[PDB]
Symmetry: none
Subunit: 85 residues, 2 copies
């Protein structure tokens, strides 16, 4: 089922919480801010929970555990493989 | 990778748990029915043993002890913590 507006506001709150927690705290942590910002953009563009690569619905379990997830698992593979070229 | 005979055996275990919980049945017991159904779906979607959160392979021991495991332990931790927000 498509996410409600109340669910999305919670993801936005979670994402801003993570974005703020990294200010007090590298190569690995800069990549994370880019993912968090992109997830926040997708909330503004009304595409949160939709895979940037395939347009498929990102499973709610994945978003619940990883609120900055902007791709499906299969698409994140393709993305990471692309970074290697 | 799991054989088809192993997956059919997990499917048999999972359907038996689902049936044993209908005669028996709480808040904890509803969470279990959702997990069992999801594990059964992953068998139909050919994703059993693959973590719903990370796509990592769920350890074979974990599946043997917990046939309704749909996430790695670390991913279930992240998932359970996410449900608490709000």
């Amino acid at each position: 089922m498509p996410l409600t507006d109340e669910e999305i506001a919670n993801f936005k709150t979670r994402l801003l919480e993570m974005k703020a927690k990294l200010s007090h705290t590298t190569t690995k942590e800069y990549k994370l801010l880019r993912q968090i910002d992109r997830a926040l953009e997708k909330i503004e563009e009304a595409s949160y929970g939709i895979c940037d690569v395939s347009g498929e619905e990102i499973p709610l379990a994945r978003l619940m555990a990883i609120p900055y997830a902007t791709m499906t698992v299969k698409s994140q593979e393709k993305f990471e493989k692309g970074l290697l070229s």
